[PDB]
Amino acid sequence: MQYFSPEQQYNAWIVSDLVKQIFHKRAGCSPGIHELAVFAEEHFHIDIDFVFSIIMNIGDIEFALTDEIEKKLSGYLSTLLPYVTADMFETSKANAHAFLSAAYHLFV
Amino acid sequence: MQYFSPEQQYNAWIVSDLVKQIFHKRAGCSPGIHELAVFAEEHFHIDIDFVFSIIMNIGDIEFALTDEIEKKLSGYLSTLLPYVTADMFETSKANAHAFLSAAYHLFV
């Protein structure tokens, strides 16, 4: 069981929420755990496996460092930001802190 | 975003860990987020989607109550317990508390 800081869980959670809201905007309702997963891979080449592992701490990963586990999550951010508005962003940030209960730093 | 108590996240996390360790016993290494998922459905008729939602709080569910969200998770427990030993159990219990940092009550 590898250790992942709350700030790491935070950024990882945003990714999931950005891509989610992007789903619930395109579709009318809201995603499915497995659904949203395929949606983040085929549409944004995002690796949900990696992302969920960081959150739940379940499962291991290869590039398990810090500088890496960052440029990777941030890479996803930059990829989604363009398609999300201000509200969507703030909404996911709120939900993240709500899930982690302190302010955290967003990767890049 | 539905609310799920830590005690709910706890039991939900055990399920994932029991089925996981059962995987890393059968296979030599350790699961994959998506892998372990199929493994819990085909081998134990366990609904990982439901379980993960409770943990990460991501995604919604239908039978979102308490008495229900219990007899369901507990149903999974009883299903896995038979195949797990004492160490495996204690190991998952420890990892759970480690992920939630208090002692919690295990469903049935």
**Resolution at which this structure was determined, Å:** 2.5
Determine the Cα–Cα distance for residues A45 and A42; give it in Å rounded to an integer: 6
The pair of structure tokens assigned to B30 is 């350790």
All residues of chain A having their beta carbon less than 8 Å from the beta carbon of residue B48 are: 33
CA dihedral B16, B17, B18, B22 (to 10 degrees): 100
DSSP bridge pairs for A27: A24
d(C-alpha B2, C-alpha B30), whole Å: 31
- Alpha helices by DSSP H, listed for chain B, are 6-26, 33-42, 48-56, 68-80, 86-99
Which chain A residues touch B59 with a CB distance below 8 Å?
30-33, 36
Under 8 Å CB pairs connecting chains A and B tally to: 54
Whether B36 has its CB under 8 Å from any CB of chain A: the answer is yes
Total domains, chain A: 1
Q: Which two tokens stand for residue B7?
A: 């005690």
Write out the residue range of the structural domain in which residue B106 sits: 2-108
> Residue B75 sits in a domain of what CATH number?
1.10.8.570
Q: How far is A10 from A55, CA to CA, in rounded Å?
A: 8
- The answer to whether B30 contacts A95, with C-beta atoms less than 8 Å apart, is no
Experimental method: X-ray
